[PDB]
Design an enzyme around this catalytic site. Structure first.
Site, short mmCIF file in Angstrom:
data_model
loop_
_atom_site.label_atom_id
_atom_site.label_comp_id
_atom_site.label_asym_id
_atom_site.label_seq_id
_atom_site.Cartn_x
_atom_site.Cartn_y
_atom_site.Cartn_z
CB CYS A 186 -0.39 2.34 3.87
SG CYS A 186 -2.02 1.64 3.46
CB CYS A 220 -0.92 -0.02 1.22
SG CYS A 220 -1.98 1.44 1.44
#
Length: 103
Positions: free
Chosen positions: A31, A28
């Site tokens: 993230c 991700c």
């Protein structure tokens, strides 16, 4: 600063007080972008709120239990209950605004 939580000890760490749980994964990208923001936020709320990280790849059941479909997803817990949800990248200000709304 940011403590790790898993399927095994989730209910244990998330039960009393206010916690912000960050559902992320290594693949991700956004993230990774939020990570540093959380490390700072974690400092601003030392003693007020706890910030935890839960890797969805290694702990899918907890992710499933809270309907976490996309990430990053941040969930605010109060006395073991999910009371707020934030999706996608968010600047420090917005996240603090969500915590104060529950402290």
């Amino acid at each position: 600063a940011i403590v790790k939580v898993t399927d095994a000890d989730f209910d244990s760490k998330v039960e009393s007080g206010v916690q912000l749980v960050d559902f992320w994964a290594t693949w991700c990208g956004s993230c990774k972008m939020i990570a540093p923001v959380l490390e700072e936020l974690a400092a601003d709320y030392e003693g007020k709120a706890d910030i935890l990280k839960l890797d969805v790849d290694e702990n899918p059941s907890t992710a499933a239990k809270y309907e976490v479909m996309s990430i990053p997803t941040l969930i605010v817990f109060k006395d073991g209950q999910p009371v707020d949800k934030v999706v996608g990248f968010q600047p420090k200000e917005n996240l603090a605004e969500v915590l104060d709304k529950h402290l």
